[PDB]
């Protein structure tokens, strides 16, 4: 409940709602990735790191169900 409740005071503290199912996470893999190509330097691989990263939420989310993370 302290979850269900707090979730609502999240809406009170800052009204807005994204989309779950790792969906919110997936966006970064795309968006952030583009802002790395046109970034050049060494911050292209570091930022590409946030592509390598957010992929976990959907991966474990889905793998925890038995579906192929790939």
């Amino acid at each position: 409940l302290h979850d269900s409740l707090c979730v609502v005071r999240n809406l009170v503290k800052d009204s807005r709602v994204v989309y779950g199912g790792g969906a919110a996470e997936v966006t970064m893999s795309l968006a952030v990735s583009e802002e790395a190509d046109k970034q050049r330097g060494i911050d292209q691989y570091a930022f590409r790191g946030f592509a390598q990263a957010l992929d976990t939420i959907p991966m474990t989310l889905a793998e925890n169900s038995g579906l192929d993370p790939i």
Binding site: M59, D68, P69, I70
Partner: protein, 102 residues
Amino acid sequence: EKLIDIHPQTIIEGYRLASAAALDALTKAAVDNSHDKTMFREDLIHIAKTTLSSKILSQDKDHFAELATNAILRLKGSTNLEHIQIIKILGGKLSDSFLDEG
């Protein structure tokens, strides 16, 4: 390991088939010849050198690369490396290590 996040026993299939493609291309890029004893000696030294480098004895790299390519020459191809024995004595300095024909 990272890839394992995804079945393993299949990953072996790739590394044995894909690194086989690599194994293949590496043969293509290879450079054969020559087979003239005139040219050989000049390659064998280059090999002995590249190998003898990075080893305490690199200092006089040539001195050794010569030692090697010689003993290898005697006994055509391909003979066991058991007749040419590497004996060693504690004698002042380095590079006093010659090859002996007896």
